[PDB]
């Protein structure tokens, strides 16, 4: 009634009637932003200039009745001058600080409810626990982290639609909530906010603070969850780490993810030790995940993962030999596999490397709405027997099975602009990208998969590409049907065998992906970086060599065997490719032996660079190496044997060794350093004498030096665009 009377009043005036008639709803936004021009260019200067004025602050005209014109000292609090383009009056800051001491008082009891997020921050800081401060060689990595967690199974647009449904039911337009998560959250918030006495706009902003996810790229070390990101300034520094645990309640999915990350790191590190089982146990007892001991989490966490199950089995716990893939819990009833990287060409003409599992295997798929039995061979689906609930559940199960099968048809079914790198050029998991692509639109995948006639066995139905229950022909190898932890023993080499004696898990089955933890992973031992990421592992390994250079040098001179067997090099050896560990070790050991027998050719930097590669059991081959590869976030990063490298660059001007762009420390020149330009640790069986010498014909390559014999000097294009004279001993 008041609204319609005010509208009738505005329609009676000539100008307001013109505005109301000639302005459409679309142009209402334009006229709402319409202004004469707020000449604001330097707000800091403008504020400093205005705070010297008598009345720099505007206020509503009610202040002339709510606040007196003058205070006790007679100072004026407001003036009758109106602000430009409005009926607001000009007031002094004295008016605001007078209100804060003499104004009417209301009940501020609903403020903690309306601003629950900020008071939640206050509570998390209040009940948080601070640990010691450790000064370390920090290696921060720019990654996408969430600063506002929002709701788990929601996006920004879905959260906005849910908010509109909850707060403005009659303004939702054509949107209908389809996701079951949206319906559940909508019902929950409608019941919780029933008979609420807050303004609807304020309620909408509360729900935005509560439900809308926000992620950003930040240079982050430690946990990437919101509770750790909000205190990232406090907990992480350039040279220090502050141990801290937020005081609130920790989400369990973050615990699961961090446990998976820690277990994978621990298992991969333990695989290279002499006794993997003891190393795994002592690492699991020394690991904390968000202020909680890892062993307790393992005892009370039902997470289906290979490394987590290996960690459980090492401690006598019962495991479920299962894993997750695309929202389903797989379990290998029978079969075996060996991973193998195979490059494939996508349907949209993209080249990528996919970890292909060889061998024949059988699986069972379990999901919240569907169940299936899967048999497969190398990149070939033998059969799939789905027994889902509705059409969409069976469709999702079929899509997941097709992606899992790694069928070349599935690869060639890719269309559109499907990206396999991050927006920051970070490599993504190809299988996850294929899943997300085919879960948006799978018509082309089903079309190109094929068809196959069914023989009507047991009455199991067929399925057509458009999701219909045919009885004559079905998708190739797909059939439709209708609707436990075990005690294990773990070997010395982390081989998990069932009570009967069959192998269930192995270290080779552990994923090679190097992820990051949602909750900060604290490791307490001599090497706090022993289960850290590859960048931290490399930097800290070379810094450990630098700091201990005196006794390491003495041991290298006297007893190299014990030096190569230091436990500190094992995290490094977990980065060297498994097939090349022995070759690199043997090559580097031969280089070191030649370096010892040729006095004066003592290059400190060469020894420091090549030492971590000698920690593996040596395999003797005649292959020459110009560079050694190290896996860093999936890409083999080479360390060039001669000269600097992206991983390892030594600066002679500063005497400062920089690894992956992180300072590792300054070396000190040895008296036995060779100030003569003679190198003996570059070629396996050839000693560098000097620069180019045209007397010995044209320059050749390192990979063609076998034909040379004893004393045959030659010129080799070893290194980055350099030719030097080498001789054979």
């Amino acid at each position: 009634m008041e609204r319609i009377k005010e509208l009738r009043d505005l329609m009676s005036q000539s100008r307001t009637r013109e505005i109301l008639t000639k302005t459409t709803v679309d142009h209402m936004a334009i006229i709402k932003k319409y202004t004469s021009g707020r000449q604001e260019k330097n707000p800091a200067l403008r504020m400093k200039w205005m705070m010297a004025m008598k009345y720099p602050i505007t206020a509503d005209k009610r202040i002339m009745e709510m606040i007196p014109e003058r205070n006790e000292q007679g100072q004026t609090l407001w003036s009758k001058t109106n602000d430009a383009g409005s009926d607001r009056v000009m007031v002094s800051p004295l008016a605001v600080t007078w209100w804060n001491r003499n104004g009417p008082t209301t009940s501020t009891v609903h403020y903690p409810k309306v601003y629950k997020t900020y008071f939640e921050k206050v509570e998390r800081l209040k009940h948080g626990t601070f640990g010691p401060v450790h000064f370390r060689n920090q290696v921060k990595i720019r990654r996408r982290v969430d600063i506002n967690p929002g709701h788990a199974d929601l996006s920004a647009k879905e959260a906005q639609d849910v908010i509109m449904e909850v707060v403005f039911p009659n303004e939702v337009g054509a949107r209908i909530l389809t996701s079951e998560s949206q319906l559940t959250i909508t019902k929950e918030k409608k019941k919780e906010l029933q008979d609420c006495k807050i303004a609807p706009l304020m309620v909408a902003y509360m729900l935005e603070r509560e439900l809308v996810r926000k992620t950003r790229f930040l240079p982050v070390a430690g946990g990437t969850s919101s509770v750790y990101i909000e205190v990232l300034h406090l907990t992480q520094g350039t040279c220090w780490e502050q141990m801290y645990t937020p005081g609130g309640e920790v989400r369990n999915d973050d615990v699961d993810q961090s446990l998976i990350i820690a277990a994978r790191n621990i298992v991969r590190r333990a695989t290279v030790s002499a006794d993997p089982l003891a190393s795994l146990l002592e690492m699991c007892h020394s690991t904390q995940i968000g202020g909680v001991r890892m062993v307790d989490i393992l005892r009370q966490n039902p997470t289906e993962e290979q490394a987590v199950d290996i960690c459980k089995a090492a401690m006598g716990l019962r495991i479920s030999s299962s894993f997750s893939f695309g929202g389903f819990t797989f379990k290998r009833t029978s079969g075996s596999s060996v991973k193998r990287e195979e490059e494939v060409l996508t349907g949209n003409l993209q080249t990528l490397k996919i970890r292909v599992h060889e061998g024949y295997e059988e699986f069972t798929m379990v999901g919240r709405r569907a169940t299936a039995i899967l048999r497969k061979a190398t990149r070939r689906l033998i059969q799939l027997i789905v027994s889902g609930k509705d059409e969409q559940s069976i469709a999702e199960a079929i899509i997941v099975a097709m992606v899992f099968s790694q069928e070349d048809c599935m690869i060639k079914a890719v269309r559109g602009d499907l990206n396999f790198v991050n927006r920051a050029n970070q490599r993504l998991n190809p299988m996850h990208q294929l899943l997300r692509h085919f879960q948006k639109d799978a018509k082309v995948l089903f079309q190109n998969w094929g068809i196959e006639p069914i023989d009507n066995v047991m009455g199991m139905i067929g399925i057509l590409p458009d999701m219909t229950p045919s009885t004559e022909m079905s998708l190739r190898g797909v059939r439709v049907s209708k609707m436990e932890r075990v005690v294990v023993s773990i070997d010395r080499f982390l081989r998990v065998r069932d009570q009967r004696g069959n192998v269930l898990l192995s270290p080779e089955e552990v994923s090679e992906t190097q992820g990051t933890e949602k909750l900060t992973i604290t490791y307490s031992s001599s090497m706090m970086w022993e289960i850290n990421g590859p960048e931290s592992v490399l930097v800290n390994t070379y810094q450990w060599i630098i700091r201990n250079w005196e006794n390491v040098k003495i041991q290298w001179s006297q007893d190299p065997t014990m030096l190569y067997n230091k436990m500190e090099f094992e995290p490094f050896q977990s980065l060297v490719p498994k097939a090349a560990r022995g070759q690199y070790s043997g090559f580097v050991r031969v280089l070191f032996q030649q370096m010892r027998d040729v006095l004066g050719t003592f290059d400190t930097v060469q020894i420091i660079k090549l030492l971590p590669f000698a920690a593996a059991p040596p395999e003797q081959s005649r292959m020459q190496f110009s560079s050694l590869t190290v896996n860093v976030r999936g890409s083999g990063m080479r360390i060039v044997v001669r000269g600097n490298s992206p991983v390892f660059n030594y600066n002679k001007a500063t005497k400062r060794l920089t690894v992956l762009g992180k300072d590792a420390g300054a070396l000190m020149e040895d008296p036995d350093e060779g100030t003569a330009g003679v190198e003996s640790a570059v070629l396996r069986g050839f000693l560098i004498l000097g620069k180019e010498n045209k007397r010995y014909g044209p320059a050749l390559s390192i990979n063609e030096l076998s034909n040379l014999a004893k004393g045959e000097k030659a010129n080799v294009l070893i290194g980055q665009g350099d030719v030097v004279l080498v001789m054979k001993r």
Binding site: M1, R3, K5, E6, L7, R8, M11, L20, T23, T24, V25, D26, H27, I30, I31, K33, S36, G37, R38, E40, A44, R46, M47, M50, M51, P56, I57, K61, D83, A84, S86, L94, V96, T97, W99, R101, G103, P104, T106, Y111, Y118, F119, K121, R142, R144, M164, V167, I198, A199, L201, F217, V231, L232, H233, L234, G237, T238, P646, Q720, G721
Partner: protein, 724 residues
């Protein structure tokens, strides 16, 4: 001992002390008078870079236009705009061949954007050159004036609310024989009726001015403000260029901050890994000389034509309009000049519109030469500028062109033992060259330089250098085996921002936290920064501690509030309370940080929704850096300079606009939360909403039949008033 700070670099690498080389504690240089000299210099230089091109007279505006496309191949290393169209088309073709489907998918996304974008997208921005007033206006004000003029001239396709319909209206306005406007003077309204050529000259005109507060430049430079007619087309072209750039690994746009640094580092490391160990690698820290004064709108039209192959005709047309309008663009000369008589002790303003036929005795030698060079180009008070992209426009399309030139450096294209790749962001670039020896490096650099010359890109020799790969500079980011911190760049952000007390406190603490996270701001320096910010905040807002005797006008009130308070820690710093911030709680709003330390009555007064300084409820007025609104979230006064001009009716008009908008919000509660959409008028929408709501209330029994009948009677009265 003479103190030499520069000798610090003898031990600290320059990248690790790069903050010392940015003197960003003093005031930046400013421009004092006119920008006409710089604008004329830019026009003359742009035409000089293309002087060997073909001259034509535009049949629609009469402006002389210089066409450097397919001009003679240069024989020297001077800058030139003689880009070859076939070379640009071939670069586009090879870019499409190395990334199959990039243009098709980008066109699909851009078609969706074009079909869905609303007209109020044009209000996003500060100023738009209003052709109806021959000066800059706020973007919303310029759009409103343009829409009103179009409606008065029977151009009402924009009533759909879509941006493309507004562009159709612009195109239709181009064909009107006469466009009518309205002018004010000392305050009556006068109608002015432009002719076809006059309106066409106004619509193709970009305003010009000087750039104030620019760091690192000895001399001032000109900048441009696009008009209302071209903004939508530029938005659509930039949307297409953005779609293309998102799919390119070498692009430096549109990624910024830590994401940009991570992408650049990953791309550089991928280039290093792909490089063979037995080959040299060099990186070029490269700049381009006068990129925007040498690139031609005709080449951008060619690029858009190649990109939109096999697309619907309407999409190609709507994308092509922007380069076409940009190749016929005119430039406002600016304010003009001021003339000083020493003997008679007088000064006077000379408008730029008189420079066409003004006596040249007044001007000095350099300005006289500028005017003599530019007079043939002057038409209708503006200068004909066919070549060049004016200033800060089509940056992502420039990025696309640069990335295509970078992409030309694969071994499949060089067909030799050298190859190149690198990074591209608008005009800035970094280039990595690999070759078996130094001769190959030289050959690859030469080939890159000559290819850029072919497509009209001139590599600044005096601002570029080359060294072994591992250190470079790109878009002011300094890479030394990884991007280093640069604190001096964010140093001006520290201080009182000037919104209000609450917002400024939040900004100070948030800036300290962000610089701790990103720019390697240490904890001790963070505490000292907090102390300095608190000191500046207390001095700026006259809110020193209550228990001090700093004599300010506000000190007595703060003393009174301090005396009556029981728990002093609960008072905000704005109220004279103490500073409770430290490193651990930088992320917490002040009102929430000390909420439980406040007196009940003080807290009730501070967070009182019925206070006049901010427009069970809570204080609400656009609450940037203000989590909880208090009485300290006031709004300062607006500038009152408009009251002395003839545009002072805009104040009354915006007051009535705000009144109508608030009345509308009384009918559609979600309008403030999410922008409403609709072709119906405001009164019609409100009446329909009132009728449906009254019917529903009657049906559910919330109101009785008498009130329903009264609402229906008032609605009928409003409908009757609507027609008359």
């Amino acid at each position: 001992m003479d103190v030499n700070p520069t000798l610090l670099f003898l031990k600290v690498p320059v990248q690790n002390a790069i903050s010392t080389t940015f003197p960003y504690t003093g005031d930046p240089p400013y421009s004092h008078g006119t920008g006409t000299g710089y604008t004329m210099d830019t026009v003359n230089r742009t035409h000089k870079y293309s002087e060997k091109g073909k001259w034509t007279t535009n049949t629609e505006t009469g402006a002389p236009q210089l066409n450097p496309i397919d001009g003679p191949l240069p024989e020297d290393n001077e800058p030139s705009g003689y880009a070859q169209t076939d070379c640009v088309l071939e670069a586009m073709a090879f870019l499409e061949e190395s990334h199959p489907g990039i243009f098709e998918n980008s066109c699909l996304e851009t078609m969706e954007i074009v079909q869905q974008t609303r007209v109020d997208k044009l209000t996003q921005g500060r100023q738009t050159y209003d052709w109806t007033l021959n000066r800059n206006q706020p973007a919303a004000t310029a759009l409103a004036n343009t829409i009103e003029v179009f409606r008065s001239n029977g151009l009402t396709a924009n009533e759909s609310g879509r941006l493309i319909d507004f562009l159709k209206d612009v195109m239709d306005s181009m064909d009107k024989e006469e466009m009518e406007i309205t002018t004010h003077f000392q305050i009556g309204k006068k109608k002015q009726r432009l002719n076809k050529r006059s309106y066409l000259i106004r619509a193709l005109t970009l305003n010009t001015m000087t750039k104030d507060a620019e760091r690192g430049k000895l001399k001032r430079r000109a900048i441009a403000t696009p008009g209302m007619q071209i903004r939508g087309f530029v938005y659509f072209v930039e949307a297409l260029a953005r779609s293309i750039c998102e799919k390119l690994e070498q692009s430096g746009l549109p990624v910024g901050g830590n994401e940009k640094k991570a992408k650049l580092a990953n791309v550089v490391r991928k280039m290093m890994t792909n490089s063979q160990d037995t080959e040299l690698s060099f990186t070029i820290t490269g700049d381009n000389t006068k990129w925007n004064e040498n690139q031609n709108p005709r080449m951008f039209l060619a690029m858009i034509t190649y990109i939109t192959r096999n697309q619907p005709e309407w999409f190609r047309n709507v994308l092509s309009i922007a380069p076409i309008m940009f190749s016929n663009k005119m430039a406002r000369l600016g304010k003009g000049y001021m003339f000083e008589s020493k003997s008679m002790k007088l000064r006077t303003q000379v408008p730029a519109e008189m420079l066409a036929n003004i006596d040249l005795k007044y001007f000095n030698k350099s300005t006289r030469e500028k005017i003599e060079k530019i007079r043939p180009l002057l038409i209708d008070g503006t200068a004909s500028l066919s070549p060049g992209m004016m200033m800060g426009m089509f940056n992502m399309l420039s990025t696309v062109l640069g990335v295509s030139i970078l992409n030309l450096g694969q071994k499949k294209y060089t067909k030799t033992t050298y190859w190149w790749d690198g990074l591209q962001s608008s005009d800035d670039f970094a280039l990595i060259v690999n070759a078996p020896n130094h001769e190959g490096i030289q050959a690859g650099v030469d080939r890159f330089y000559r290819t850029c010359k072919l497509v009209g890109i001139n590599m600044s020799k005096k601002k570029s250098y080359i060294n072994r790969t591992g250190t470079f500079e790109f878009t002011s980011f300094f890479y030394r085996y990884g991007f280093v911190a640069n604190f001096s760049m964010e140093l001006p952000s520290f201080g009182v921002s000037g919104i209000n007390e609450s917002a400024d406190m939040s900004v100070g603490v948030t800036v300290i936290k962000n610089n701790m996270i990103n720019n390697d701001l240490g904890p001790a320096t963070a505490q000292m920064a907090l102390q300095l910010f608190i000191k500046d905040y207390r001095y700026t807002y006259r809110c020193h501690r209550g228990d001090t005797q700093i004599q300010t006008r506000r000190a007595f009130e703060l003393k009174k509030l301090w005396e009556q308070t029981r728990s002093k820690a609960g008072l905000l710093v704005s109220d004279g309370g103490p500073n409770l911030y430290n490193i651990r709680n930088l992320h917490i709003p002040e009102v929430c940080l000390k909420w439980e330390l406040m007196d009940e009555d003080y807290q009730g007064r501070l967070c009182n929704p019925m206070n006049p300084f901010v427009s069970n409820a809570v204080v609400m007025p656009s609450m940037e850096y203000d989590a909880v609104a208090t009485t300290h979230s006031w709004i300062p006064k607006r500038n009152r300079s408009i009251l002395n001009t003839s545009q002072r009716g805009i104040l009354e008009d915006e007051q009535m606009y705000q009144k109508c908008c608030n009345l509308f919000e009384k009918f559609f509660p979600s309008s403030s939360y999410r922008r409403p959409v609709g072709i119906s008028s405001m009164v019609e929408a409100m009446v329909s909403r009132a009728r449906i709501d009254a019917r529903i209330d009657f049906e559910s029994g919330r109101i009785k039949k008498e009130e329903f009948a009264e609402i229906m009677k008032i609605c009928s009265t409003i409908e009757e008033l609507r027609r008359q």
